[PDB]
Amino acid sequence: KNVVIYADGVYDMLHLGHMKQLEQAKKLFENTTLIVGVTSDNETKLFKGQVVQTLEERTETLKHIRWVDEIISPCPWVVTPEFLEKYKIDYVAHDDDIYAWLKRAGKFKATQRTEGVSTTDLIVRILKN
Amino acid sequence: KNVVIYADGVYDMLHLGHMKQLEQAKKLFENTTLIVGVTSDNETKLFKGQVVQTLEERTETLKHIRWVDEIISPCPWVVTPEFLEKYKIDYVAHDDDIYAWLKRAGKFKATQRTEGVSTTDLIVRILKN
């Protein structure tokens, strides 16, 4: 009955938008184990761009989130079928290509962002007044 | 057997220092219920100073923290003996006076901060490079 959900990301400067997203993945089914994958510093900088917190800092914060059952840190940048079987992962949960193959196999669960909850956006707030 | 712990604060721009603190309060005893009190905007601004997030924003974040069992939002600024009996609170957990009476009654559990984990401190980081 227990469903294993895998949600990877940078999770830099974790904000309410991340937490709602993680909560959404966690609650995709009645009984889940949510695994969170945290990208490596070298690969984030190389593909997304600057990261503020290190791997260790990004990972320690996640362990304080109610919805997070297990963490893979660091995780691979691109999910592979081998990665799924390795970790017994039934569904990948990520915002919405790179995931065509996941959707084709029925294993893609879309989760949404919440705009404007960003740490960035809040410094703007204190700055904007 | 279950012990009720009460941890109040502003919890503005929640960072790893808050979460470790909350985790510490939660784990003060084997079986706890941790109640978190979130101060009101008007009273924080009036006593501590500027707050960045509103009550609602500060409170929504806390509900995503593993250690948080119940939230009182907003909470009173000064804890009273009546407040303890009202909510069946056995221990107040806060950093370390205002709490003499709590320590005198055996109901004060000290929890510690973690310096330099602040949101502030991280903007300094991105700014400092």
Side-chain angles (χ1 to χ4, degrees), chain A residues 6-29 31-41:
Chain A
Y6 178 62
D8 55 345
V10 187
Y11 302 103
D12 197 23
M13 298 184 287
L14 206 77
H15 50 88
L16 179 65
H18 293 95
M19 314 173 185
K20 294 157 73 56
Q21 189 148 38
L22 291 178
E23 182 195 14
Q24 193 186 337
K26 167 74 174 153
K27 289 175 173 174
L28 287 182
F29 300 96
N31 301 119
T32 72
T33 300
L34 173 56
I35 310 182
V36 181
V38 192
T39 41
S40 79
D41 283 331

mmCIF file of all heavy atoms in Angstrom, chain A residues 6-41, unseen atoms left out:
data_model
loop_
_atom_site.group_PDB
_atom_site.id
_atom_site.type_symbol
_atom_site.label_atom_id
_atom_site.label_comp_id
_atom_site.label_asym_id
_atom_site.label_seq_id
_atom_site.Cartn_x
_atom_site.Cartn_y
_atom_site.Cartn_z
ATOM 1 N N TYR A 6 9.529 10.512 -5.172
ATOM 2 C CA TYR A 6 10.865 11.097 -5.269
ATOM 3 C C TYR A 6 10.759 12.524 -5.799
ATOM 4 O O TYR A 6 10.299 12.735 -6.927
ATOM 5 C CB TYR A 6 11.770 10.254 -6.176
ATOM 6 C CG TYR A 6 13.117 10.869 -6.324
ATOM 7 C CD1 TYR A 6 13.940 11.033 -5.214
ATOM 8 C CD2 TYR A 6 13.569 11.324 -7.558
ATOM 9 C CE1 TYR A 6 15.181 11.620 -5.328
ATOM 10 C CE2 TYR A 6 14.816 11.912 -7.679
ATOM 11 C CZ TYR A 6 15.617 12.062 -6.550
ATOM 12 O OH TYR A 6 16.858 12.659 -6.652
ATOM 13 N N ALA A 7 11.193 13.497 -4.994
ATOM 14 C CA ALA A 7 11.145 14.921 -5.348
ATOM 15 C C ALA A 7 12.550 15.506 -5.273
ATOM 16 O O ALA A 7 13.085 15.713 -4.177
ATOM 17 C CB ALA A 7 10.204 15.684 -4.414
ATOM 18 N N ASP A 8 13.155 15.767 -6.419
ATOM 19 C CA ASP A 8 14.498 16.328 -6.435
ATOM 20 C C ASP A 8 14.445 17.826 -6.733
ATOM 21 O O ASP A 8 13.458 18.354 -7.254
ATOM 22 C CB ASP A 8 15.372 15.598 -7.469
ATOM 23 C CG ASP A 8 14.760 15.608 -8.854
ATOM 24 O OD1 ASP A 8 13.545 15.913 -8.955
ATOM 25 O OD2 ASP A 8 15.477 15.350 -9.843
ATOM 26 N N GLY A 9 15.527 18.508 -6.388
ATOM 27 C CA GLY A 9 15.607 19.942 -6.583
ATOM 28 C C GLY A 9 16.824 20.496 -5.876
ATOM 29 O O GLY A 9 17.558 19.776 -5.186
ATOM 30 N N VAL A 10 17.034 21.798 -6.071
ATOM 31 C CA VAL A 10 18.147 22.467 -5.407
ATOM 32 C C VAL A 10 17.806 22.761 -3.953
ATOM 33 O O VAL A 10 18.674 22.686 -3.071
ATOM 34 C CB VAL A 10 18.508 23.756 -6.163
ATOM 35 C CG1 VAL A 10 19.798 24.377 -5.580
ATOM 36 C CG2 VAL A 10 18.664 23.480 -7.635
ATOM 37 N N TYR A 11 16.542 23.110 -3.694
ATOM 38 C CA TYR A 11 16.055 23.510 -2.371
ATOM 39 C C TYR A 11 16.960 24.553 -1.712
ATOM 40 O O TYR A 11 17.181 24.547 -0.493
ATOM 41 C CB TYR A 11 15.866 22.289 -1.478
ATOM 42 C CG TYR A 11 14.904 21.277 -2.059
ATOM 43 C CD1 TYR A 11 15.369 20.112 -2.663
ATOM 44 C CD2 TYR A 11 13.526 21.490 -2.012
ATOM 45 C CE1 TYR A 11 14.488 19.188 -3.210
ATOM 46 C CE2 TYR A 11 12.648 20.571 -2.542
ATOM 47 C CZ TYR A 11 13.131 19.423 -3.134
ATOM 48 O OH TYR A 11 12.252 18.511 -3.655
ATOM 49 N N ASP A 12 17.477 25.468 -2.527
ATOM 50 C CA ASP A 12 18.243 26.593 -2.010
ATOM 51 C C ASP A 12 17.330 27.570 -1.273
ATOM 52 O O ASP A 12 16.241 27.908 -1.751
ATOM 53 C CB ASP A 12 18.951 27.315 -3.164
ATOM 54 C CG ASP A 12 20.079 28.215 -2.697
ATOM 55 O OD1 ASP A 12 20.599 27.980 -1.594
ATOM 56 O OD2 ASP A 12 20.448 29.154 -3.440
ATOM 57 N N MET A 13 17.773 28.026 -0.106
ATOM 58 C CA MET A 13 17.052 29.027 0.676
ATOM 59 C C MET A 13 15.556 28.699 0.782
ATOM 60 O O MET A 13 14.679 29.485 0.415
ATOM 61 C CB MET A 13 17.277 30.411 0.088
ATOM 62 C CG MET A 13 18.727 30.836 0.112
ATOM 63 S SD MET A 13 18.878 32.521 -0.506
ATOM 64 C CE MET A 13 18.588 32.323 -2.280
ATOM 65 N N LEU A 14 15.295 27.518 1.345
ATOM 66 C CA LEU A 14 13.956 26.927 1.424
ATOM 67 C C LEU A 14 12.894 27.915 1.886
ATOM 68 O O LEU A 14 12.999 28.490 2.967
ATOM 69 C CB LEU A 14 13.987 25.747 2.397
ATOM 70 C CG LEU A 14 12.942 24.650 2.177
ATOM 71 C CD1 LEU A 14 13.370 23.784 1.022
ATOM 72 C CD2 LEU A 14 12.747 23.812 3.442
ATOM 73 N N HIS A 15 11.827 28.051 1.106
ATOM 74 C CA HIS A 15 10.735 28.948 1.462
ATOM 75 C C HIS A 15 9.392 28.210 1.405
ATOM 76 O O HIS A 15 9.306 27.039 1.034
ATOM 77 C CB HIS A 15 10.730 30.184 0.554
ATOM 78 C CG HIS A 15 10.807 29.863 -0.908
ATOM 79 N ND1 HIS A 15 9.689 29.630 -1.684
ATOM 80 C CD2 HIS A 15 11.871 29.757 -1.742
ATOM 81 C CE1 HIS A 15 10.060 29.392 -2.931
ATOM 82 N NE2 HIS A 15 11.378 29.467 -2.994
ATOM 83 N N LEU A 16 8.329 28.933 1.769
ATOM 84 C CA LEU A 16 6.989 28.355 1.823
ATOM 85 C C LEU A 16 6.586 27.709 0.502
ATOM 86 O O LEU A 16 5.811 26.741 0.490
ATOM 87 C CB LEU A 16 5.990 29.434 2.210
ATOM 88 C CG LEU A 16 4.524 29.034 2.292
ATOM 89 C CD1 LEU A 16 4.318 28.028 3.401
ATOM 90 C CD2 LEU A 16 3.639 30.265 2.498
ATOM 91 N N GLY A 17 7.110 28.215 -0.613
ATOM 92 C CA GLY A 17 6.824 27.600 -1.896
ATOM 93 C C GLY A 17 7.379 26.195 -2.015
ATOM 94 O O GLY A 17 6.721 25.311 -2.572
ATOM 95 N N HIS A 18 8.611 25.975 -1.518
ATOM 96 C CA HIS A 18 9.162 24.620 -1.452
ATOM 97 C C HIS A 18 8.321 23.737 -0.548
ATOM 98 O O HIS A 18 8.008 22.584 -0.883
ATOM 99 C CB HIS A 18 10.599 24.626 -0.923
ATOM 100 C CG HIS A 18 11.587 25.265 -1.837
ATOM 101 N ND1 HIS A 18 11.967 26.587 -1.718
ATOM 102 C CD2 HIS A 18 12.304 24.758 -2.866
ATOM 103 C CE1 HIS A 18 12.865 26.868 -2.644
ATOM 104 N NE2 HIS A 18 13.098 25.774 -3.346
ATOM 105 N N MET A 19 7.998 24.241 0.638
ATOM 106 C CA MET A 19 7.316 23.395 1.602
ATOM 107 C C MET A 19 5.941 22.982 1.093
ATOM 108 O O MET A 19 5.552 21.825 1.240
ATOM 109 C CB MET A 19 7.231 24.118 2.937
ATOM 110 C CG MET A 19 8.551 24.761 3.340
ATOM 111 S SD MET A 19 8.403 25.791 4.815
ATOM 112 C CE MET A 19 10.064 26.503 4.908
ATOM 113 N N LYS A 20 5.196 23.892 0.469
ATOM 114 C CA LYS A 20 3.898 23.494 -0.076
ATOM 115 C C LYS A 20 4.071 22.437 -1.149
ATOM 116 O O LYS A 20 3.335 21.437 -1.182
ATOM 117 C CB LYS A 20 3.165 24.704 -0.638
ATOM 118 C CG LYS A 20 2.773 25.716 0.410
ATOM 119 C CD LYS A 20 2.587 27.079 -0.205
ATOM 120 C CE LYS A 20 1.314 27.140 -1.019
ATOM 121 N NZ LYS A 20 0.178 26.752 -0.143
ATOM 122 N N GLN A 21 5.059 22.637 -2.021
ATOM 123 C CA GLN A 21 5.400 21.653 -3.034
ATOM 124 C C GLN A 21 5.686 20.298 -2.403
ATOM 125 O O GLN A 21 5.108 19.281 -2.802
ATOM 126 C CB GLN A 21 6.608 22.148 -3.826
ATOM 127 C CG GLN A 21 6.936 21.335 -5.049
ATOM 128 C CD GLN A 21 7.525 22.208 -6.149
ATOM 129 O OE1 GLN A 21 8.300 23.139 -5.876
ATOM 130 N NE2 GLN A 21 7.151 21.923 -7.401
ATOM 131 N N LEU A 22 6.583 20.261 -1.414
ATOM 132 C CA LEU A 22 6.890 18.991 -0.759
ATOM 133 C C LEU A 22 5.636 18.389 -0.116
ATOM 134 O O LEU A 22 5.358 17.192 -0.266
ATOM 135 C CB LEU A 22 8.002 19.184 0.276
ATOM 136 C CG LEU A 22 9.399 19.488 -0.261
ATOM 137 C CD1 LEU A 22 10.381 19.693 0.894
ATOM 138 C CD2 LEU A 22 9.902 18.372 -1.170
ATOM 139 N N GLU A 23 4.864 19.205 0.603
ATOM 140 C CA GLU A 23 3.603 18.716 1.147
ATOM 141 C C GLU A 23 2.731 18.120 0.049
ATOM 142 O O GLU A 23 2.042 17.113 0.265
ATOM 143 C CB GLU A 23 2.831 19.837 1.852
ATOM 144 C CG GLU A 23 1.520 19.351 2.466
ATOM 145 C CD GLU A 23 0.557 20.468 2.863
ATOM 146 O OE1 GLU A 23 0.759 21.627 2.448
ATOM 147 O OE2 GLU A 23 -0.431 20.176 3.576
ATOM 148 N N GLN A 24 2.728 18.738 -1.132
ATOM 149 C CA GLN A 24 1.872 18.231 -2.198
ATOM 150 C C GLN A 24 2.334 16.848 -2.633
ATOM 151 O O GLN A 24 1.544 15.893 -2.684
ATOM 152 C CB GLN A 24 1.865 19.203 -3.374
ATOM 153 C CG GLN A 24 0.789 18.908 -4.363
ATOM 154 C CD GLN A 24 0.869 19.783 -5.604
ATOM 155 O OE1 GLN A 24 1.439 20.890 -5.590
ATOM 156 N NE2 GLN A 24 0.297 19.285 -6.697
ATOM 157 N N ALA A 25 3.631 16.711 -2.909
ATOM 158 C CA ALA A 25 4.170 15.401 -3.242
ATOM 159 C C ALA A 25 3.856 14.386 -2.148
ATOM 160 O O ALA A 25 3.406 13.272 -2.429
ATOM 161 C CB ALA A 25 5.679 15.500 -3.485
ATOM 162 N N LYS A 26 4.085 14.752 -0.887
ATOM 163 C CA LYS A 26 3.877 13.798 0.202
ATOM 164 C C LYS A 26 2.451 13.265 0.197
ATOM 165 O O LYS A 26 2.227 12.075 0.440
ATOM 166 C CB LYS A 26 4.210 14.450 1.552
ATOM 167 C CG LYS A 26 3.748 13.657 2.777
ATOM 168 C CD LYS A 26 4.635 12.457 2.999
ATOM 169 C CE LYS A 26 4.318 11.729 4.280
ATOM 170 N NZ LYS A 26 4.700 10.305 4.123
ATOM 171 N N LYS A 27 1.477 14.132 -0.081
ATOM 172 C CA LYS A 27 0.063 13.791 -0.019
ATOM 173 C C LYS A 27 -0.482 13.321 -1.357
ATOM 174 O O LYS A 27 -1.705 13.268 -1.537
ATOM 175 C CB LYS A 27 -0.755 14.987 0.489
ATOM 176 C CG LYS A 27 -0.538 15.285 1.980
ATOM 177 C CD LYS A 27 -1.263 16.541 2.428
ATOM 178 C CE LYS A 27 -1.177 16.708 3.950
ATOM 179 N NZ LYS A 27 -1.754 18.009 4.431
ATOM 180 N N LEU A 28 0.392 12.972 -2.301
ATOM 181 C CA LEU A 28 -0.113 12.483 -3.577
ATOM 182 C C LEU A 28 -0.959 11.231 -3.393
ATOM 183 O O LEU A 28 -1.915 11.022 -4.144
ATOM 184 C CB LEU A 28 1.045 12.223 -4.540
ATOM 185 C CG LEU A 28 1.680 13.503 -5.080
ATOM 186 C CD1 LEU A 28 2.802 13.174 -6.072
ATOM 187 C CD2 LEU A 28 0.617 14.402 -5.702
ATOM 188 N N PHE A 29 -0.634 10.395 -2.403
ATOM 189 C CA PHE A 29 -1.412 9.196 -2.091
ATOM 190 C C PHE A 29 -1.545 9.068 -0.576
ATOM 191 O O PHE A 29 -0.790 9.683 0.181
ATOM 192 C CB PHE A 29 -0.780 7.917 -2.676
ATOM 193 C CG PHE A 29 -0.646 7.933 -4.183
ATOM 194 C CD1 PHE A 29 0.549 8.319 -4.787
ATOM 195 C CD2 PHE A 29 -1.714 7.571 -5.000
ATOM 196 C CE1 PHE A 29 0.677 8.341 -6.172
ATOM 197 C CE2 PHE A 29 -1.593 7.584 -6.390
ATOM 198 C CZ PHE A 29 -0.393 7.972 -6.977
ATOM 199 N N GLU A 30 -2.514 8.251 -0.144
ATOM 200 C CA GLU A 30 -2.826 8.115 1.281
ATOM 201 C C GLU A 30 -1.603 7.708 2.100
ATOM 202 O O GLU A 30 -1.296 8.318 3.128
ATOM 203 C CB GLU A 30 -3.957 7.097 1.473
ATOM 204 N N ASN A 31 -0.892 6.676 1.668
ATOM 205 C CA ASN A 31 0.287 6.190 2.377
ATOM 206 C C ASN A 31 1.507 6.329 1.475
ATOM 207 O O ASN A 31 1.642 5.591 0.494
ATOM 208 C CB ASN A 31 0.083 4.742 2.809
ATOM 209 C CG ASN A 31 -1.121 4.582 3.705
ATOM 210 O OD1 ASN A 31 -2.074 3.861 3.369
ATOM 211 N ND2 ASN A 31 -1.097 5.268 4.862
ATOM 212 N N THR A 32 2.400 7.261 1.816
ATOM 213 C CA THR A 32 3.619 7.496 1.055
ATOM 214 C C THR A 32 4.866 7.443 1.930
ATOM 215 O O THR A 32 4.821 7.612 3.158
ATOM 216 C CB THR A 32 3.619 8.861 0.382
ATOM 217 O OG1 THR A 32 3.788 9.875 1.394
ATOM 218 C CG2 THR A 32 2.340 9.072 -0.402
ATOM 219 N N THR A 33 5.990 7.233 1.250
ATOM 220 C CA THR A 33 7.303 7.645 1.718
ATOM 221 C C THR A 33 7.827 8.645 0.704
ATOM 222 O O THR A 33 7.959 8.308 -0.475
ATOM 223 C CB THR A 33 8.247 6.457 1.830
ATOM 224 O OG1 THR A 33 7.688 5.520 2.751
ATOM 225 C CG2 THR A 33 9.619 6.893 2.297
ATOM 226 N N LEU A 34 8.087 9.875 1.147
ATOM 227 C CA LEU A 34 8.610 10.917 0.272
ATOM 228 C C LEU A 34 10.129 10.943 0.410
ATOM 229 O O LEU A 34 10.657 11.112 1.520
ATOM 230 C CB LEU A 34 8.000 12.274 0.610
ATOM 231 C CG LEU A 34 8.621 13.453 -0.140
ATOM 232 C CD1 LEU A 34 8.569 13.275 -1.654
ATOM 233 C CD2 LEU A 34 7.985 14.769 0.280
ATOM 234 N N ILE A 35 10.830 10.724 -0.704
ATOM 235 C CA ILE A 35 12.278 10.861 -0.754
ATOM 236 C C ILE A 35 12.598 12.163 -1.460
ATOM 237 O O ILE A 35 12.059 12.444 -2.538
ATOM 238 C CB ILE A 35 12.949 9.680 -1.469
ATOM 239 C CG1 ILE A 35 12.449 8.345 -0.900
ATOM 240 C CG2 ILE A 35 14.434 9.818 -1.319
ATOM 241 C CD1 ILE A 35 13.111 7.117 -1.542
ATOM 242 N N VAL A 36 13.441 12.974 -0.836
ATOM 243 C CA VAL A 36 13.853 14.255 -1.375
ATOM 244 C C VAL A 36 15.283 14.087 -1.846
ATOM 245 O O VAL A 36 16.107 13.505 -1.132
ATOM 246 C CB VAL A 36 13.728 15.368 -0.319
ATOM 247 C CG1 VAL A 36 14.134 16.699 -0.887
ATOM 248 C CG2 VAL A 36 12.318 15.410 0.244
ATOM 249 N N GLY A 37 15.569 14.538 -3.060
ATOM 250 C CA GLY A 37 16.913 14.519 -3.614
ATOM 251 C C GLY A 37 17.407 15.953 -3.657
ATOM 252 O O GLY A 37 16.676 16.849 -4.070
ATOM 253 N N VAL A 38 18.638 16.160 -3.209
ATOM 254 C CA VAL A 38 19.239 17.480 -3.109
ATOM 255 C C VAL A 38 20.425 17.517 -4.052
ATOM 256 O O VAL A 38 21.342 16.682 -3.947
ATOM 257 C CB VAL A 38 19.658 17.806 -1.668
ATOM 258 C CG1 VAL A 38 19.990 19.270 -1.563
ATOM 259 C CG2 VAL A 38 18.522 17.451 -0.713
ATOM 260 N N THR A 39 20.413 18.474 -4.980
ATOM 261 C CA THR A 39 21.430 18.454 -6.013
ATOM 262 C C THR A 39 22.778 18.879 -5.448
ATOM 263 O O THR A 39 22.872 19.543 -4.411
ATOM 264 C CB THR A 39 21.026 19.335 -7.194
ATOM 265 O OG1 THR A 39 20.436 20.541 -6.709
ATOM 266 C CG2 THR A 39 20.009 18.595 -8.049
ATOM 267 N N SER A 40 23.834 18.457 -6.136
ATOM 268 C CA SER A 40 25.190 18.747 -5.704
ATOM 269 C C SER A 40 25.544 20.186 -6.048
ATOM 270 O O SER A 40 24.991 20.779 -6.982
ATOM 271 C CB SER A 40 26.182 17.782 -6.360
ATOM 272 O OG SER A 40 26.477 18.147 -7.708
ATOM 273 N N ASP A 41 26.474 20.755 -5.273
ATOM 274 C CA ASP A 41 26.873 22.140 -5.517
ATOM 275 C C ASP A 41 27.450 22.289 -6.910
ATOM 276 O O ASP A 41 27.058 23.183 -7.667
ATOM 277 C CB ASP A 41 27.886 22.614 -4.467
ATOM 278 C CG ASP A 41 27.233 22.939 -3.128
ATOM 279 O OD1 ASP A 41 26.048 23.339 -3.127
ATOM 280 O OD2 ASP A 41 27.895 22.792 -2.075
#
